[PDB]
Design a protein around this motif. Structure first.
Motif, PDB file in Angstrom:
ATOM      1  N   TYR A   2      -5.290  -3.341  14.769  1.00  0.00           N
ATOM      2  CA  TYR A   2      -6.001  -2.102  15.023  1.00  0.00           C
ATOM      3  C   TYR A   2      -6.783  -1.609  13.804  1.00  0.00           C
ATOM      4  CZ  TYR A   2      -2.575  -2.469  18.816  1.00  0.00           C
ATOM      5  OH  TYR A   2      -1.795  -2.941  19.869  1.00  0.00           O
ATOM      6  N   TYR A  37     -10.691   3.344  13.373  1.00  0.00           N
ATOM      7  CA  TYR A  37      -9.660   4.308  13.799  1.00  0.00           C
ATOM      8  C   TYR A  37      -9.174   5.128  12.618  1.00  0.00           C
ATOM      9  CZ  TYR A  37      -9.451   1.355  17.965  1.00  0.00           C
ATOM     10  OH  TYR A  37      -9.708   0.579  19.085  1.00  0.00           O
ATOM     11  N   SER A  93      -1.003   7.563   6.150  1.00  0.00           N
ATOM     12  CA  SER A  93      -1.367   6.888   7.383  1.00  0.00           C
ATOM     13  C   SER A  93      -1.015   5.392   7.378  1.00  0.00           C
ATOM     14  CB  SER A  93      -2.867   7.051   7.587  1.00  0.00           C
ATOM     15  OG  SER A  93      -3.551   6.628   6.412  1.00  0.00           O
ATOM     16  N   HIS A 131     -11.634  -1.106  12.798  1.00  0.00           N
ATOM     17  CA  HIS A 131     -12.297  -0.586  13.984  1.00  0.00           C
ATOM     18  C   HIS A 131     -12.802   0.823  13.746  1.00  0.00           C
ATOM     19  CE1 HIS A 131     -11.402  -3.854  16.808  1.00  0.00           C
ATOM     20  NE2 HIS A 131     -10.409  -4.074  15.965  1.00  0.00           N
ATOM     21  N   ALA A 166      -9.004   0.112   1.761  1.00  0.00           N
ATOM     22  CA  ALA A 166      -9.316   0.606   3.082  1.00  0.00           C
ATOM     23  C   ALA A 166      -9.041   2.098   3.120  1.00  0.00           C
ATOM     24  CB  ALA A 166      -8.539  -0.136   4.142  1.00  0.00           C
ATOM     25  N   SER A 177      -4.996  13.440  -0.939  1.00  0.00           N
ATOM     26  CA  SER A 177      -4.581  12.110  -0.528  1.00  0.00           C
ATOM     27  C   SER A 177      -4.416  11.243  -1.789  1.00  0.00           C
ATOM     28  CB  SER A 177      -5.633  11.493   0.441  1.00  0.00           C
ATOM     29  OG  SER A 177      -5.245  10.186   0.852  1.00  0.00           O
ATOM     30  N   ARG A 178      -3.616  10.195  -1.711  1.00  0.00           N
ATOM     31  CA  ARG A 178      -3.595   9.243  -2.839  1.00  0.00           C
ATOM     32  C   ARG A 178      -3.534   7.821  -2.349  1.00  0.00           C
ATOM     33  NH1 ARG A 178       0.389  10.730  -7.198  1.00  0.00           N
ATOM     34  NH2 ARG A 178       1.083   8.556  -7.320  1.00  0.00           N
ATOM     35  N   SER A 207      -1.870  13.933   3.262  1.00  0.00           N
ATOM     36  CA  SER A 207      -1.762  13.065   4.432  1.00  0.00           C
ATOM     37  C   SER A 207      -1.325  11.675   4.039  1.00  0.00           C
ATOM     38  CB  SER A 207      -3.098  13.020   5.177  1.00  0.00           C
ATOM     39  OG  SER A 207      -4.092  12.423   4.365  1.00  0.00           O
ATOM     40  N   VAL A 213     -11.738   5.251   3.511  1.00  0.00           N
ATOM     41  CA  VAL A 213     -11.596   6.302   4.536  1.00  0.00           C
ATOM     42  C   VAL A 213     -11.727   7.702   3.927  1.00  0.00           C
ATOM     43  CG1 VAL A 213     -10.021   7.397   6.170  1.00  0.00           C
ATOM     44  CG2 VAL A 213     -10.135   4.883   6.058  1.00  0.00           C
ATOM     45  N   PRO A 219       0.804  -1.228   0.000  1.00  0.00           N
ATOM     46  CA  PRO A 219       0.000   0.000   0.000  1.00  0.00           C
ATOM     47  C   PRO A 219       0.833   1.272   0.000  1.00  0.00           C
ATOM     48  CG  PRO A 219       0.086  -0.862   2.240  1.00  0.00           C
ATOM     49  CD  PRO A 219       1.020  -1.735   1.375  1.00  0.00           C
ATOM     50  N   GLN A 227      -0.991   8.907  11.770  1.00  0.00           N
ATOM     51  CA  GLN A 227      -1.695   9.744  10.808  1.00  0.00           C
ATOM     52  C   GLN A 227      -0.828  10.975  10.536  1.00  0.00           C
ATOM     53  OE1 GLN A 227      -4.929   9.430   8.912  1.00  0.00           O
ATOM     54  NE2 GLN A 227      -3.357  10.697   7.925  1.00  0.00           N
TER      55      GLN A 227
HETATM   56  C1  LIG Z   1      -5.439   2.558   5.429  1.00  0.00           C
HETATM   57  C2  LIG Z   1      -5.681   2.378   6.941  1.00  0.00           C
HETATM   58  C3  LIG Z   1      -4.919   3.448   7.776  1.00  0.00           C
HETATM   59  C4  LIG Z   1      -7.228   2.489   7.140  1.00  0.00           C
HETATM   60  O1  LIG Z   1      -7.569   2.364   8.550  1.00  0.00           O
HETATM   61  P1  LIG Z   1      -8.720   1.355   9.096  1.00  0.00           P
HETATM   62  O2  LIG Z   1      -8.367  -0.062   8.820  1.00  0.00           O
HETATM   63  O3  LIG Z   1      -8.821   1.829  10.622  1.00  0.00           O
HETATM   64  O4  LIG Z   1     -10.050   1.884   8.388  1.00  0.00           O
HETATM   65  P2  LIG Z   1     -11.548   2.082   8.948  1.00  0.00           P
HETATM   66  O5  LIG Z   1     -11.788   3.413   9.567  1.00  0.00           O
HETATM   67  O6  LIG Z   1     -11.809   0.806   9.857  1.00  0.00           O
HETATM   68  O7  LIG Z   1     -12.375   1.945   7.602  1.00  0.00           O
HETATM   69  C5  LIG Z   1     -11.846   1.122   6.582  1.00  0.00           C
HETATM   70  C6  LIG Z   1     -12.788   1.052   5.391  1.00  0.00           C
HETATM   71  O8  LIG Z   1     -12.155   0.004   4.629  1.00  0.00           O
HETATM   72  C7  LIG Z   1     -13.133  -0.873   4.153  1.00  0.00           C
HETATM   73  N1  LIG Z   1     -12.310  -2.053   3.698  1.00  0.00           N
HETATM   74  C8  LIG Z   1     -11.315  -2.649   4.371  1.00  0.00           C
HETATM   75  N2  LIG Z   1     -10.794  -3.664   3.670  1.00  0.00           N
HETATM   76  C9  LIG Z   1     -11.486  -3.726   2.533  1.00  0.00           C
HETATM   77  C10 LIG Z   1     -11.426  -4.580   1.416  1.00  0.00           C
HETATM   78  N3  LIG Z   1     -10.510  -5.561   1.357  1.00  0.00           N
HETATM   79  N4  LIG Z   1     -12.260  -4.378   0.379  1.00  0.00           N
HETATM   80  C11 LIG Z   1     -13.159  -3.396   0.431  1.00  0.00           C
HETATM   81  N5  LIG Z   1     -13.254  -2.570   1.487  1.00  0.00           N
HETATM   82  C12 LIG Z   1     -12.423  -2.700   2.545  1.00  0.00           C
HETATM   83  C13 LIG Z   1     -14.016  -0.951   5.417  1.00  0.00           C
HETATM   84  O9  LIG Z   1     -15.312  -1.496   5.157  1.00  0.00           O
HETATM   85  C14 LIG Z   1     -14.188   0.525   5.747  1.00  0.00           C
HETATM   86  O10 LIG Z   1     -15.146   1.128   4.858  1.00  0.00           O
HETATM   87  P3  LIG Z   1     -16.571   1.866   5.255  1.00  0.00           P
HETATM   88  O11 LIG Z   1     -16.592   3.208   5.900  1.00  0.00           O
HETATM   89  O12 LIG Z   1     -17.345   2.026   3.857  1.00  0.00           O
HETATM   90  O13 LIG Z   1     -17.239   0.711   6.138  1.00  0.00           O
HETATM   91  C15 LIG Z   1      -5.253   1.018   7.504  1.00  0.00           C
HETATM   92  O14 LIG Z   1      -6.073  -0.003   6.973  1.00  0.00           O
HETATM   93  C16 LIG Z   1      -3.810   0.602   7.292  1.00  0.00           C
HETATM   94  O15 LIG Z   1      -2.964   0.944   8.107  1.00  0.00           O
HETATM   95  N6  LIG Z   1      -3.598  -0.213   6.262  1.00  0.00           N
HETATM   96  C17 LIG Z   1      -2.271  -0.776   5.898  1.00  0.00           C
HETATM   97  C18 LIG Z   1      -1.305   0.347   5.504  1.00  0.00           C
HETATM   98  C19 LIG Z   1      -1.999   1.284   4.521  1.00  0.00           C
HETATM   99  O16 LIG Z   1      -2.763   0.821   3.668  1.00  0.00           O
HETATM  100  N7  LIG Z   1      -1.746   2.589   4.648  1.00  0.00           N
HETATM  101  C20 LIG Z   1      -2.405   3.559   3.754  1.00  0.00           C
HETATM  102  C21 LIG Z   1      -1.520   3.942   2.566  1.00  0.00           C
HETATM  103  S1  LIG Z   1      -2.437   5.035   1.404  1.00  0.00           S
HETATM  104  C22 LIG Z   1      -2.223   6.495   2.289  1.00  0.00           C
HETATM  105  O17 LIG Z   1      -1.299   6.542   3.099  1.00  0.00           O
HETATM  106  C23 LIG Z   1      -3.154   7.699   2.037  1.00  0.00           C
HETATM  107  C24 LIG Z   1      -4.220   7.850   3.126  1.00  0.00           C
HETATM  108  C25 LIG Z   1      -4.035   9.120   3.983  1.00  0.00           C
HETATM  109  O18 LIG Z   1      -4.275  10.200   3.443  1.00  0.00           O
HETATM  110  O19 LIG Z   1      -3.683   9.008   5.166  1.00  0.00           O
END
Ligand SMILES: CC(C)(COP(=O)(O)OP(=O)(O)OC[C@H]1O[C@@H](n2cnc3c(N)ncnc32)[C@H](O)[C@@H]1OP(=O)(O)O)[C@@H](O)C(=O)NCCC(=O)NCCSC(=O)CCC(=O)O
Ligand SMILES: CC(C)(COP(=O)(O)OP(=O)(O)OC[C@H]1O[C@@H](n2cnc3c(N)ncnc32)[C@H](O)[C@@H]1OP(=O)(O)O)[C@@H](O)C(=O)NCCC(=O)NCCSC(=O)CCC(=O)O
Ligand SMILES: CC(C)(COP(=O)(O)OP(=O)(O)OC[C@H]1O[C@@H](n2cnc3c(N)ncnc32)[C@H](O)[C@@H]1OP(=O)(O)O)[C@@H](O)C(=O)NCCC(=O)NCCSC(=O)CCC(=O)O
Ligand SMILES: CC(C)(COP(=O)(O)OP(=O)(O)OC[C@H]1O[C@@H](n2cnc3c(N)ncnc32)[C@H](O)[C@@H]1OP(=O)(O)O)[C@@H](O)C(=O)NCCC(=O)NCCSC(=O)CCC(=O)O
Lengths: 210, 210, 210, 210
Positions: free
Chosen positions: C116, C121, C110, C119, C152, C144-145, C108, C156, C44, C93
């Motif tokens: 975690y 968060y 994250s 949930h 996920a 954001s990208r 941003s 967000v 990611p 974040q």
């Molecule tokens: C990306 C985040 C930070 C997202 O945090 P959370 O897991 O707490 O998210 P959340 O608030 O629980 O909500 C997640 C949303 O993802 C959906 N979701 C999760 N997995 C899914 C999947 N496989 N297919 C379809 N949808 C999915 C959930 O239903 C929910 O949508 P609904 O509201 O519709 O129910 C994390 O997952 C993470 O750390 N992931 C691994 C590292 C990563 O991907 N980092 C982001 C890089 S990209 C980036 O950095 C830019 C983002 C930024 O600006 O910060």
């Protein structure tokens, strides 16, 4: 280029002409390099640029030279002067300085095509940039350094009157190489100079240096 | 240089020739710059280079062109192509890419001397680099950006088949400026292409990009 | 540090506290990373930092966080806010900007430890920095990208009201990856916001940003 | 940090303890800095960081220390060791090296808060890092440079047995400053070492350097 007065600079001695390398002279310098610069069992340079393959040398050289020309700043400059024997590029005698207006201290770096070594050109082309530095730039000190196993450049420095200025060591192709440092004050430069040098095309360049 | 095959590349349209700028072509590009590039009440560049004094503009241009020429790497290149109308370099149509062998995406940047604008050279010269990228380099996507108050580059992009690809904003001379991003797919390029473009002397350059 | 007022900034939501990471929090963060951040089948991040070995990861992370803390400038800053649940660091974040006083645009980045995720968060912690950005720094746009296969973070962003703002493609571990870009204006933020956010300890920080 | 073994290194002498600065120790160093480091008539530093306002000094110092902490690499490292007197950080004895595995050569930099100067701390703290460099790191040479008008560091060098190793000149706050270079071989270190030195917690750090 006809848009940068530093291209009009000429430093001439009875045997040599030094000048910033034009597009034509860069290509000549690459031709000289490809004929050989040093015996392959030596490394006289800090950066082992002569190890590059035949195919890579031409662009690596163009690149370096372009970057050096392009990086000219009053407070950080490097002047790689092509050295000519009857209009043909035989090598480079560079002169450079960081914070020259304040320090009035220049250093140098040099190479000649292999077949051109051992005829006093290295001593003369050094004498040439030193004349430029002290008489035109009003430098106060010139420094150089040579690997301990690079006696041709050591002798050139000793000939031009430089004094010992301590010891250094650097990584050279994966192995520790000892280096000797040399220092030339304007006094020393005067007492040892024997080459008649003339500079032309410099008036328009004066304000680039200060 | 005769030691870098990129200098043999020619991209010709019915009215234009594009090639890598040699020593003379760089100086022609500078002669053109000194006649004017854009309306002074306007800043179509993210780097305000056209603001520099008449005294500084010539070296700033050389420095930059040299850095780009020196900077060619397979995974990070910028081609600043000189655009020739008669026997004069009238502007630059650049094409550049980072990680091109993977992304197959290019971007472009452009300028023309003031006296040469409005003759459709902008559209033709974009068509020329686009044909080169898609047909020779085998790109899949081409991008471009314009400030919202630079309608001529916007119109060039639209005429060449590019689609909206989002909004940006940057600091332009200490004020915020909005930009429009443009994206051209290979298939959109075919749909909208009208200009006959020919490429010569690329065969020996091919490995450099691949 | 008790010598940098940004360490006193607190952004609090019903479940979360965000703050600049102290020595202890950086160490909690590394603990969390060593437990795992994402399924190894996915990438990611733009920089494959999670691919580093378990031996190398702790120092890579410290070096990275140290550099972002050290790098703060008015016209170029990144705030790697540790995200705390139950007083312990679960992720980061980040908020960052170039030329913010002029562009008033932030972006941003994250990540959360695996246990975690899911949930809410991520949504809540985005909401937290969006509020700080618009209400505290007076941003006008947030961006954001996300990689297309990173649903996920996409979700967000959509949840916080960002709009699609184009397509990009980069090299990702030797293969081409499509990225989706996102843009949120002040008004869109204010139309989609639902999280109660409180900011403390920012009064002394305000002059650092403008 | 508990995730970087270099934090476990302790170099102890009868009066002093040297270690990598933790968050607490950085804050203590800054406290010490704000009480003053040198006579403002004097500039002992190549970078005049002590000229910053009392307002900027703390973040400038955190930024510097974080960068050195973060920049650690086998082939390019700097260790800014805090010097503790009675458990409080009163200055820094840095040790640094480029290409150490090959050259086996280190250099050093130091400062102490005004009130801690003149009690033999500088002499002892040098011996401390020299013993570490020669006895633990397996160095062969240590170097140092002092401005001509910085007799305290000169004296520390002479007392530790370094030999004169040439002259340099640099720009110092807009003016030319002369510097003296000092060199200490493993042999001359051996001949002259008096100070008793213990090094702990290096066992796990050793591979990081070799
Ligand atoms: C990306 C985040 C930070 C997202 O945090 P959370 O897991 O707490 O998210 P959340 O608030 O629980 O909500 C997640 C949303 O993802 C959906 N979701 C999760 N997995 C899914 C999947 N496989 N297919 C379809 N949808 C999915 C959930 O239903 C929910 O949508 P609904 O509201 O519709 O129910 C994390 O997952 C993470 O750390 N992931 C691994 C590292 C990563 O991907 N980092 C982001 C890089 S990209 C980036 O950095 C830019 C983002 C930024 O600006 O910060
Ligand atoms: C170093 C130079 C430019 C030197 O040029 P020349 O060979 O033309 O030198 P020269 O004027 O003919 O004089 C050379 C002096 O060295 C002596 N000499 C030559 N080889 C020797 C050897 N193996 N042992 C002892 N003495 C030797 C000659 O007798 C003469 O000394 P007397 O007058 O006492 O009779 C060249 O050889 C070269 O390009 N070499 C390969 C690349 C290189 O080494 N570059 C230098 C990197 S060091 C650097 O760049 C700093 C130097 C600078 O500041 O320019
Ligand atoms: C951008 C160019 C190269 C554009 O070329 P020209 O001026 O030759 O325009 P052209 O080819 O004659 O015509 C192309 C389209 O522009 C329209 N057009 C021309 N001038 C216009 C104007 N003043 N206002 C509105 N529309 C205008 C024409 O009708 C035509 O539309 P139709 O087809 O509908 O009839 C030039 O204006 C220029 O160099 N300007 C100064 C520097 C600059 O702006 N550089 C671009 C910065 S932005 C950038 O670099 C990204 C662009 C890129 O990727 O190359
Ligand atoms: C340089 C140090 C660390 C020196 O430490 P101390 O003050 O503990 O010195 P010391 O061990 O007690 O020994 C000091 C000896 O210095 C001499 N001495 C001190 N001040 C002098 C002066 N003004 N004129 C002439 N001699 C003087 C005396 O011989 C004195 O010994 P007696 O007691 O018998 O009379 C400090 O003064 C300091 O931090 N100064 C301010 C910043 C600075 O100058 N930093 C060094 C920059 S140069 C650098 O960093 C490279 C050096 C390195 O490798 O660390």
């Amino acid at each position: 280029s006809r848009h940068w007065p530093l291209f009009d600079l000429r430093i001439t001695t009875p045997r040599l002409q030094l000048q910033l390398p034009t597009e034509e002279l860069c290509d000549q310098l690459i031709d000289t390099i490809l004929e050989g610069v040093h015996d392959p069992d030596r490394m006289p340079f800090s950066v082992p640029w002569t190890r590059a393959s035949r195919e890579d040398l031409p662009f690596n050289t163009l690149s370096h030279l372009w970057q050096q020309l392009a990086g000219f700043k009053r407070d950080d400059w490097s002047l790689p002067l092509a050295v000519l024997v009857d209009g043909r590029a035989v090598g480079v005698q560079a002169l450079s300085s960081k914070d020259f207006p304040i320090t009035r201290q220049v250093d140098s770096g040099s190479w000649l095509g292999l077949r051109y070594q051992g005829h006093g050109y290295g001593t003369e082309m050094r004498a040439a940039v030193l004349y430029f530095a002290f008489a035109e730039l009003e430098a106060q000190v010139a420094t150089s350094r040579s690997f301990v196993d690079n006696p041709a450049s050591i002798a050139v420095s000793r000939r031009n009157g430089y004094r010992d200025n301590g010891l250094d060591r650097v990584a050279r192709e994966g192995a520790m190489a000892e280096a000797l440092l040399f220092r030339l004050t304007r006094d020393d430069w005067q007492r040892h100079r024997t080459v008649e040098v003339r500079v032309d095309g410099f008036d328009r360049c004066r304000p680039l240096f200060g």
